Amino acid sequence: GKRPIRLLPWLQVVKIGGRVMDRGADAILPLVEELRKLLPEHRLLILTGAGVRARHVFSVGLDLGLPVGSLAPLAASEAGQNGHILAAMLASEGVSYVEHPTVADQLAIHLSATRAVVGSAFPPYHHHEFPGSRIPPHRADTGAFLLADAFGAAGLTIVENVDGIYTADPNGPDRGQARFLPETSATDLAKSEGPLPVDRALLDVMATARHIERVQVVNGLVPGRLTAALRGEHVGTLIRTGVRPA
Amino acid sequence: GKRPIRLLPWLQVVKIGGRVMDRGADAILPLVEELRKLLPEHRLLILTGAGVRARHVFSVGLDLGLPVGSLAPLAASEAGQNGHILAAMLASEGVSYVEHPTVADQLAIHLSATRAVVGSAFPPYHHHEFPGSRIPPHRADTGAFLLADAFGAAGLTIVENVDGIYTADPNGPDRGQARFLPETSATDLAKSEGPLPVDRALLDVMATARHIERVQVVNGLVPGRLTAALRGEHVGTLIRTGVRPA
Amino acid sequence: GKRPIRLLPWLQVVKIGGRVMDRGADAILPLVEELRKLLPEHRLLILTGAGVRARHVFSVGLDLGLPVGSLAPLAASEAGQNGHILAAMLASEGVSYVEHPTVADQLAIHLSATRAVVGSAFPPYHHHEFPGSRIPPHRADTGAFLLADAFGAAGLTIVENVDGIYTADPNGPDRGQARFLPETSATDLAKSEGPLPVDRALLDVMATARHIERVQVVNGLVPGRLTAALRGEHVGTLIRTGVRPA
Amino acid sequence: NSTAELEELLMQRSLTDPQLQAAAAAAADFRILPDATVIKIGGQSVIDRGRAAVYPLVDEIVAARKNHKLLIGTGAGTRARHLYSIAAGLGLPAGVLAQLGSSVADQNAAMLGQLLAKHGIPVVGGAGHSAVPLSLAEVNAVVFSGMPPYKLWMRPAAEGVIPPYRTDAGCFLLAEQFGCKQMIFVKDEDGLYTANPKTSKDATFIPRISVDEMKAKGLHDSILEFPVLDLLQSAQHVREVQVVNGLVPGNLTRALAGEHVGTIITAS
Amino acid sequence: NSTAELEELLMQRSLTDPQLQAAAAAAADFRILPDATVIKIGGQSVIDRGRAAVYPLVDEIVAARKNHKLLIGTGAGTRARHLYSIAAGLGLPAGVLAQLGSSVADQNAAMLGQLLAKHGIPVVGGAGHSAVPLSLAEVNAVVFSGMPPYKLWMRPAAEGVIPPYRTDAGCFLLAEQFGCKQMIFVKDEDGLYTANPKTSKDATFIPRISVDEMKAKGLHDSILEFPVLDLLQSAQHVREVQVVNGLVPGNLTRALAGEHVGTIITAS
Amino acid sequence: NSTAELEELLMQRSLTDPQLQAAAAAAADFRILPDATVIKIGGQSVIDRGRAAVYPLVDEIVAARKNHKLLIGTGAGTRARHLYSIAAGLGLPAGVLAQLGSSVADQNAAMLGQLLAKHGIPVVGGAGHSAVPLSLAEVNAVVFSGMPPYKLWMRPAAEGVIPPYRTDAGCFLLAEQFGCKQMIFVKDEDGLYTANPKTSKDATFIPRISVDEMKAKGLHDSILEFPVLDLLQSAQHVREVQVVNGLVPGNLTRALAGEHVGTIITAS
Ligand SMILES: Nc1ncnc2c1ncn2[C@@H]1O[C@H](COP(=O)(O)OP(=O)(O)OP(=O)(O)O)[C@@H](O)[C@H]1O
Ligand SMILES: Nc1ncnc2c1ncn2[C@@H]1O[C@H](COP(=O)(O)OP(=O)(O)OP(=O)(O)O)[C@@H](O)[C@H]1O
Ligand SMILES: Nc1ncnc2c1ncn2[C@@H]1O[C@H](COP(=O)(O)OP(=O)(O)OP(=O)(O)O)[C@@H](O)[C@H]1O
Ligand SMILES: Nc1ncnc2c1ncn2[C@@H]1O[C@H](COP(=O)(O)OP(=O)(O)OP(=O)(O)O)[C@@H](O)[C@H]1O
Ligand SMILES: Nc1ncnc2c1ncn2[C@@H]1O[C@H](COP(=O)(O)OP(=O)(O)OP(=O)(O)O)[C@@H](O)[C@H]1O
Ligand SMILES: Nc1ncnc2c1ncn2[C@@H]1O[C@H](COP(=O)(O)OP(=O)(O)OP(=O)(O)O)[C@@H](O)[C@H]1O
Ligand SMILES: [Cl-]
Ligand SMILES: [Cl-]
Ligand SMILES: [Cl-]
Ligand SMILES: [Mg+2]
Ligand SMILES: [Mg+2]
Numbered sequence A, B, C: 001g002k003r004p005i006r007l008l009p010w011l012q013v014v015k016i017g018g019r020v021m022d023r024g025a026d027a028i029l030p031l032v033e034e035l036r037k038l039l040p041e042h043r044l045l046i047l048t049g050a051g052v053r054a055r056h057v058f059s060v061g062l063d064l065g066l067p068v069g070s071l072a073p074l075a076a077s078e079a080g081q082n083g084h085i086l087a088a089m090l091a092s093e094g095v096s097y098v099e100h101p102t103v104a105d106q107l108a109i110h111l112s113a114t115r116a117v118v119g120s121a122f123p124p125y126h127h128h129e130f131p132g133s134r135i136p137p138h139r140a141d142t143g144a145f146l147l148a149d150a151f152g153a154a155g156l157t158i159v160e161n162v163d164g165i166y167t168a169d170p171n172g173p174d175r176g177q178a179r180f181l182p183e184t185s186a187t188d189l190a191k192s193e194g195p196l197p198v199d200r201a202l203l204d205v206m207a208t209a210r211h212i213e214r215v216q217v218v219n220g221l222v223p224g225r226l227t228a229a230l231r232g233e234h235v236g237t238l239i240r241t242g243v244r245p246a
Numbered sequence D, E, F: 001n002s003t004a005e006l007e008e009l010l011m012q013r014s015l016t017d018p019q020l021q022a023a024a025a026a027a028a029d030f031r032i033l034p035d036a037t038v039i040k041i042g043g044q045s046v047i048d049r050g051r052a053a054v055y056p057l058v059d060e061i062v063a064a065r066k067n068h069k070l071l072i073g074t075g076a077g078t079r080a081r082h083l084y085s086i087a088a089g090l091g092l093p094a095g096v097l098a099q100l101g102s103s104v105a106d107q108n109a110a111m112l113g114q115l116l117a118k119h120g121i122p123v124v125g126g127a128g129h130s131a132v133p134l135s136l137a138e139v140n141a142v143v144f145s146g147m148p149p150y151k152l153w154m155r156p157a158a159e160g161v162i163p164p165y166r167t168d169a170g171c172f173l174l175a176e177q178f179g180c181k182q183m184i185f186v187k188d189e190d191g192l193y194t195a196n197p198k199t200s201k202d203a204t205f206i207p208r209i210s211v212d213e214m215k216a217k218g219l220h221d222s223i224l225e226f227p228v229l230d231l232l233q234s235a236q237h238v239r240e241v242q243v244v245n246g247l248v249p250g251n252l253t254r255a256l257a258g259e260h261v262g263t264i265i266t267a268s
């Protein structure tokens, strides 16, 4: 037959890393100013990740022996708090935080009411998270992509605290061997072992994607890169999903 | 004294029959295109009925012996699913599905945010449905009228899978004797026995109506009739409610 | 360091006394007409107090021996009903009643959707109300100010059934000794004993305020005074909070 | 009419079809809470009166739940009448008044529930979630607000904007749709009289009467919301109701024990 | 790997780091509801069939909860397939179909729950709030809808828009994440066969089989949603499941008693 | 002052009128949950420490509920302090920080509740719905998050944006407004000292002290949120509190048995 229709083809989705928010005002205030200037240019769904506080609740939860389905909603809470912080900084521009069920069923009317809304990037898998790892798999990057692709959005841009994807952790033990990857495919990343700045589950949902052809990972600590990425300019790592264009 | 004020006098209410939705894309896509072109012309509350899936849950529920108050919310669920389907097709135009409490208390702000919203036509009688019949009485037509008249809306148009009301079921056993009724009164219909394309309870609530003077039943399978009916053109069956004009 | 940022610096907050609403159409209809004409001029959060029905539920609740934490949510219900009444009268202008959690987290998007919203002035202290008095302390005036100051709003205007604050109850036993106070400080009022038209807790939260410098109490029974007060004109009692300006 | 004939009709005919209606009428009849009793505690007649009326009834509820499953609904009372007066004076419709009155019945359910909390009896939304409380000897009762959920979809009366279906009708329809065994209205009079006993010197007490007999006497709207009498005549499960005086000590306990205090109103 | 090594990794590394993943895998394993059994009541296979199928199972549930804690999830069935057909014909994505199907499983939970209410058994959102019911001999069971909460975040299948994770997967993942002792799927066939017994003359019954053996036989998508078999192989707590025929009287009771009716599917 | 004098004042005067205030003060005093004990489990002092602190307290809760009705509230801890630091650095007001901190206490209630679910003890919103759990020997306890509901309406402190009313005040006000018999704060120190025992070599233990005595010693903000001491002096029902060390095995059990472990702080 053919792929499903695009529900919100004019939508741009932006995922803000929780570790970016963790840096506090020094990183958030420049990002908020850039977002302010983007409101008249795009129709934005801004989704926040969890960051370091989810690591702490994982530490406590794992020490208590709790399963992965218990850890998933605990981490998702932290992504939601980051969203409330970001929305508060944009409130004077008409921006508010919206919940999952509102995002899932009323995003259209809300983006008719205002230029942007903020929500949580974490998906509602929660106690129905998949088993296997003790770390919940379907995190902020994965939820943001599932949502963007389900909507048939014009794009998804991931805002990181690094320039993009390297061949090794650029802040880790092998940081000396880390080479920057301007462009890669989800399949190539999936066949690699080692850490990434994006969920491994993101690569899995990219393989079954129906609309989004590319996702760019850009450094939110460099003012202007988010603005450039939303115009299709190559300022970070481009991830090809495997969706073929017309 | 005088009749109550009109809360939303500029509102147009459109009820889409569940059996129209049951026809799938062949009927929904033309209807969605006509609704798209009506958004700039009217302020629309679009309410969906239940259709055949409610008949199936009635079949199971009655086989289990469940009372009418149990069947009412089960049928109402199907009207709500039809509303979610219709709203999804209009999402790119800024249209979303809204729940009963939002319809009851915030319809004003939502129609300030966007040109149309979709909701369920079934009223919240549920386990407080009236006894007497084993088939729940206050269905989609009745709920849509109660809402439209309570709001003092400019009109209510019922979108059917037939041209209007006949003197017999135009698809039933006596279909050969069925004569089309261009115009009738709720009181005349109420004194008749036999099937109708609208709830019998609709005729009862029309007798106590305070604003709506006429309701037109039109064939949603004929493109253009909904558009004409919303302009007051006579393309179906007109039902006079008994409300007298100034 | 410095005071917190202003979340909604362009917002005007108006608190409508419950005893004003208690007067019925004679007072509400002129107030509704004045509010209608203010919608194009200001971005309004309209908050309603409780009035006489809260006195009755206090009478029953105290007779049953219920503690102050039980009486607080019972009174708050009456403020919410007043808000629903007022919003219904403004529905045709796009105004709806919004709940506390919507006021707390999505006021920005709602005031982007429409020119004004109505909510309850009573704060959500409820069963966590402070002990000491058997009459709940954090009432409509106090909640409206907490909200206005938290938002950094441009102002808070209190709409009363009297001209302002007197030196005695202008409708009470010592009404003959009552002298009108055009201007006063919260600290001076707090050091006084005797009744006031505003919560005593209002004076306490004014002492810790971070933005609002003055609150005017005006007679809502005199058409035009609310309009004048929202332009900074002195037509009632001005209460200085103790917040110092730049 | 077999299940097969019913399913064919359900799929091929309009629900308005008399043949379909008749086939559905032959379906089996399941009672959801057959051993429970629904009790309405009047708002104006009881709760508005304070401790002198409410405290004795709390004692009766605590004593009665030892042997009876109880669904206890609350009325609204004078605060709802004040709201109705305000809103009616503004020209607001019945559907809006309906929403306002619901808040008042909720207040009364909260106050009554707080007096019962230490006895294990919760405040719930309605009978839909009373399954676990009603199965526990420690609880065996719930409190809920008696207003129906119609809200803005309230059907208005033929005249005026006062909602016709209030807490009497809400509680009755709950008893009917859950197939309860008994419906007791707790008011501030011994029962039905030939005239309003508060505003008439020589009214005569009526121990038992049918809906038809009430209408023929001009009592269609006296001690019960007159829509309730019509709902009672259409009911499948609750074919009579009992009206008792909550201000008489032990009246509720004795009604639950099968004593014919007050007035029994029968559908036929 | 000590808790200290795990916390350092959790703070310094990406959650994608294999070293962090391996350290987390060594954490203690807590079972939240270790003595409960999750039961899925098929929508199309059972509830859609009406009283002839449902009433006997209600009796078994009431009898079984005397000795077994039960988490009873409902399927969706034919009304969900109708919704899927409508929405798929419109080009709507899997995430939208997922939301539609949830409403149907809710309907079935409501109908089953209303037949069980007089026995004290509530309808709840899910296992998250079953603590008090499961601790009471009077109740000892709950009913919930079996659809997972993914909604618009549903991962789509490789082909088509039918949501891959439906009520089988929802119920299984609940059993797995609460560490329940047993997972029973109640269908309308005795168990797994070598072929679909409804559309094949001479299929052979399979009493016991592993996921790998099923795949090698071409049975990856037969009597269970084939994603469930993959989830089963990844499970920490529920490493086998049992599929039984709900239309055979007493089959559920006998499965709960440890009798090997039906088919046992093992992860390995 | 009769009820009649109180009603006249309630209708004719402002609630600010001292005469009305004094008449209301003479009203009867009803305790909603007089036999329950409220327990606060510290976030930073207990739950943040993991299994070594939490598992023994779970055992004590399970043992204690056999003889004591328990309302168990959770603190927030280090994740809330991180949120406060982020939001304070952005210039956000106390009301916004209040909302953020609530999410963390909810996390801790969820983790503690999941360890208690198999013992029948639920996680609830608050004491408002603890009626049925507290009436059942099988349960007799509930877990809730300890943050007050003020949210954006939080009254700010005289200085800074840290919300002054956090989980100590939330739990205390719950004990006070439900008329509970006892309030126990579970921390990580034996009780109150003359100085912070973590940052002082030779602090002296204080077994019993009044709020006034604490203030005169410069201890107004030490082991409890200093607003709590002021609320304690205004309380009608809970006129003293007990602070105990949750890291000492059995300390909570012994406090519930009436043993004077830790520090007793009295309103007067
Ligand atoms: N191959 C890699 N390329 C780039 N960064 C890597 C790689 N492997 C690990 N990293 C690390 O991942 C970090 C980003 O961490 P992470 O993705 O967990 O934060 P986040 O995306 O803000 O969190 P959240 O998922 O909660 O939004 C980088 O700072 C970097 O040190
Ligand atoms: N007198 C009549 N005139 C016209 N149609 C009739 C009459 N009697 C029965 N019908 C039948 O009613 C059908 C419409 O059915 P129905 O009104 O149940 O669907 P719907 O309105 O789409 O459903 P819902 O009430 O769930 O929205 C027509 O197709 C027609 O066959
Ligand atoms: N010093 C005073 N100055 C002015 N009015 C006073 C004073 N003391 C008492 N009052 C009385 O307070 C009345 C206003 O009452 P109140 O403030 O309770 O109503 P409200 O503000 O409408 O109620 P709510 O707080 O529910 O909104 C005035 O009509 C007046 O009689
Ligand atoms: N013929 C009659 N016999 C008995 N009582 C009558 C009669 N006619 C009128 N009444 C009056 O009807 C009243 C009962 O209605 P009322 O509204 O008080 O009940 P309620 O349950 O308190 O209502 P709500 O709960 O809505 O406040 C009695 O107070 C009584 O005075
Ligand atoms: N090899 C096989 N062995 C047994 N059954 C099979 C096999 N292949 C296919 N089936 C079919 O699988 C069906 C079970 O799936 P079905 O969807 O009916 O379960 P369900 O729980 O009712 O689903 P839902 O709850 O979503 O309606 C059986 O009706 C059976 O005909
Ligand atoms: N004089 C004192 N005596 C005892 N403890 C003191 C004193 N002064 C300061 N403290 C400190 O107060 C702390 C208790 O506050 P803390 O915030 O840890 O409690 P909490 O319940 O864990 O808070 P939360 O639940 O919000 O995390 C102790 O850890 C202790 O070090
Ligand atoms: Cl009908
Ligand atoms: Cl990963
Ligand atoms: Cl005061
Ligand atoms: Mg990342
Ligand atoms: Mg029809």
Ligand SMILES: [Mg+2]
Pocket (backbone or CB within 6 Å): C017, C141, C160, C197, C198, C199
């Ligand atoms: Mg006032």
